[PDB]
Design an enzyme around this catalytic site. Structure first.
Site, PDB file in Angstrom:
ATOM      1  N   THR A 239      -6.239   6.013   8.568  1.00 22.68           N
ATOM      2  CA  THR A 239      -6.729   6.255   7.384  1.00 22.68           C
ATOM      3  C   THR A 239      -6.628   5.187   6.440  1.00 22.68           C
ATOM      4  O   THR A 239      -7.104   5.188   5.199  1.00 22.68           O
ATOM      5  CB  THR A 239      -6.235   7.451   6.686  1.00 22.68           C
ATOM      6  OG1 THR A 239      -4.672   7.257   6.206  1.00 22.68           O
ATOM      7  CG2 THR A 239      -6.242   8.704   7.520  1.00 22.68           C
TER       8      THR A 239
ATOM      9  N   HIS B 255       1.529   9.142   1.896  1.00 23.64           N
ATOM     10  CA  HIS B 255       0.772   8.903   0.806  1.00 23.64           C
ATOM     11  C   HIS B 255       0.872  10.053  -0.336  1.00 23.64           C
ATOM     12  O   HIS B 255       1.519  11.029   0.002  1.00 23.64           O
ATOM     13  CB  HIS B 255      -0.637   9.431   1.421  1.00 23.64           C
ATOM     14  CG  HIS B 255      -0.933   8.608   2.734  1.00 23.64           C
ATOM     15  ND1 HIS B 255      -1.913   7.435   2.610  1.00 23.64           N
ATOM     16  CD2 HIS B 255      -0.800   8.788   4.000  1.00 23.64           C
ATOM     17  CE1 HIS B 255      -1.911   6.901   4.049  1.00 23.64           C
ATOM     18  NE2 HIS B 255      -1.240   7.678   4.621  1.00 23.64           N
TER      19      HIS B 255
ATOM     20  N   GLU C 243      -3.825  13.329   2.274  1.00 23.26           N
ATOM     21  CA  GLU C 243      -5.065  12.894   2.774  1.00 23.26           C
ATOM     22  C   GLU C 243      -5.979  14.143   3.190  1.00 23.26           C
ATOM     23  O   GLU C 243      -7.050  14.208   2.878  1.00 23.26           O
ATOM     24  CB  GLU C 243      -4.774  11.875   3.415  1.00 23.26           C
ATOM     25  CG  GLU C 243      -4.293  10.684   2.937  1.00 23.26           C
ATOM     26  CD  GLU C 243      -4.367   9.374   3.790  1.00 23.26           C
ATOM     27  OE1 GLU C 243      -4.031   9.327   4.929  1.00 23.26           O
ATOM     28  OE2 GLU C 243      -4.888   8.281   3.138  1.00 23.26           O
TER      29      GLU C 243
ATOM     30  N   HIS D 103       0.919  -1.302  -0.074  1.00 24.02           N
ATOM     31  CA  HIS D 103       0.083   0.063  -0.107  1.00 24.02           C
ATOM     32  C   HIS D 103       0.798   1.277  -0.004  1.00 24.02           C
ATOM     33  O   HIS D 103       0.708   2.339  -0.835  1.00 24.02           O
ATOM     34  CB  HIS D 103      -0.979  -0.118   1.214  1.00 24.02           C
ATOM     35  CG  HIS D 103      -1.694  -1.559   1.324  1.00 24.02           C
ATOM     36  ND1 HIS D 103      -2.649  -1.951   0.670  1.00 24.02           N
ATOM     37  CD2 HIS D 103      -0.949  -2.348   2.232  1.00 24.02           C
ATOM     38  CE1 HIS D 103      -2.956  -2.975   1.328  1.00 24.02           C
ATOM     39  NE2 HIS D 103      -1.834  -3.481   1.907  1.00 24.02           N
TER      40      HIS D 103
ATOM     41  N   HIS E 265       3.133  10.727   7.571  1.00 18.53           N
ATOM     42  CA  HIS E 265       2.490  10.475   8.782  1.00 18.53           C
ATOM     43  C   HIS E 265       3.328   9.742   9.678  1.00 18.53           C
ATOM     44  O   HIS E 265       3.901   8.790   9.509  1.00 18.53           O
ATOM     45  CB  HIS E 265       1.249   9.521   8.493  1.00 18.53           C
ATOM     46  CG  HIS E 265       0.258  10.103   7.737  1.00 18.53           C
ATOM     47  ND1 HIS E 265      -1.023   9.445   7.128  1.00 18.53           N
ATOM     48  CD2 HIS E 265      -0.090  11.435   7.746  1.00 18.53           C
ATOM     49  CE1 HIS E 265      -1.663  10.337   6.941  1.00 18.53           C
ATOM     50  NE2 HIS E 265      -1.401  11.676   7.081  1.00 18.53           N
TER      51      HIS E 265
ATOM     52  N   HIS F 157       5.247   6.702   7.294  1.00 22.06           N
ATOM     53  CA  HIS F 157       4.889   6.660   6.087  1.00 22.06           C
ATOM     54  C   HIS F 157       4.342   7.710   5.481  1.00 22.06           C
ATOM     55  O   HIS F 157       4.182   8.716   5.939  1.00 22.06           O
ATOM     56  CB  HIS F 157       3.976   5.514   5.728  1.00 22.06           C
ATOM     57  CG  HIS F 157       2.766   5.718   6.540  1.00 22.06           C
ATOM     58  ND1 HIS F 157       2.429   5.432   7.866  1.00 22.06           N
ATOM     59  CD2 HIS F 157       1.499   6.211   6.078  1.00 22.06           C
ATOM     60  CE1 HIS F 157       1.263   5.945   8.192  1.00 22.06           C
ATOM     61  NE2 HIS F 157       0.638   6.336   7.036  1.00 22.06           N
TER      62      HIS F 157
HETATM   63 ZN    ZN Z   1      -1.041   7.628   6.667  1.00 21.76          ZN
END
Ligand code: ZN
EC number: 4.2.1.1
Length: 258
Positions: free
Chosen positions: A196, A94, A104, A62, A117, A92
């Site tokens: 999330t 996004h 996000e 992911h 994050h 990590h």
């Molecule tokens: Zn995250």
């Protein structure tokens, strides 16, 4: 048929396996800056990452997680909206397929190119697994990324990615200093929310910094060379691994600054 970010398994489908996806405190959200009230009772945020000890980096299919040894009292977040101390376990990102999307949280509907994050667990609950059973178990520090000048402190992450291209690959990743990922200002917005990604648990005090960091186009392009698929499977580039903003449901977002 496992969850992901595609048409048939993406955020719109998550609620079937994880009904909390439609819960009362889901993340991310849009931050309406005009209506996030200043809270003078917020004590200063304390981010103490001296002596943090990274262990390993993992492509989980992911995103990629940089994991920390959280067996001792080091790398902690406290102050701000928090009661007590929260210990860093992993960070990590996004990111998007294009610079115009990827974050996000959004700010007055604006999407940044990516979002970092840093995940921490409330030490009163002993470890991450017990903390995620609690409504105040987690604190996530969120940091927006825009494309511009390179972030030198990110380069060591970028340079290991070729060794974890596909799902399930991991690498030794010691001595990485996350202080090199932090902007100058700790001004932030805060609100109660959730993880999330599945399981989407509602444990999180969110602390989203107002000041983005800049990373270079070349840095984010190397994020976009990762793969969601495992080795020997058809190549699906790891891009657009962000959940969209979710309903606020009357939660209040507070600002640390005027
Ligand atoms: Zn995250």
């Amino acid at each position: 048929h496992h969850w992901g970010y595609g048409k048939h398994n993406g955020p719109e489908h998550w609620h079937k396996d994880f009904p909390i996806a439609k819960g009362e405190r889901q993340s991310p959200v849009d931050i309406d800056t005009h209506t996030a009230k200043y809270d003078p009772s917020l004590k200063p945020l304390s981010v103490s990452y001296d002596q943090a000890t990274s262990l390993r980096i993992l492509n989980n299919g992911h995103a990629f997680n940089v994991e920390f040894d959280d067996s001792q009292d080091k790398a902690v977040l406290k102050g701000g909206p928090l009661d007590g101390t929260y210990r860093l376990i992993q960070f990590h990102f996004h990111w998007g397929s294009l610079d115009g999307q990827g974050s996000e949280h959004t700010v007055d509907k604006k999407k940044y190119a990516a979002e970092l994050h840093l995940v921490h667990w409330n030490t009163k609950y002993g470890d991450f697994g017990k903390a995620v059973q609690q409504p105040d178990g987690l604190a996530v520090l969120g940091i927006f990324l825009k494309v511009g000048s390179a972030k030198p402190g990110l380069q060591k992450v970028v340079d290991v990615l070729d060794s974890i291209k596909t799902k399930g690959k991991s690498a030794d990743f010691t001595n990485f200093d996350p202080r090199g990922l932090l902007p100058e200002s700790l001004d932030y917005w805060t609100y109660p929310g959730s993880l999330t990604t599945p399981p989407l648990l509602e444990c999180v005090t969110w602390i989203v910094l107002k000041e983005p960091i800049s990373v270079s186009s070349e840095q984010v392009l190397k994020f976009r060379k990762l793969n969601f698929n495992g080795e020997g499977e058809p190549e699906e580039l790891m891009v657009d691994n962000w959940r969209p903003a979710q309903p606020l449901k009357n939660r209040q977002i507070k600002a640390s600054f005027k």
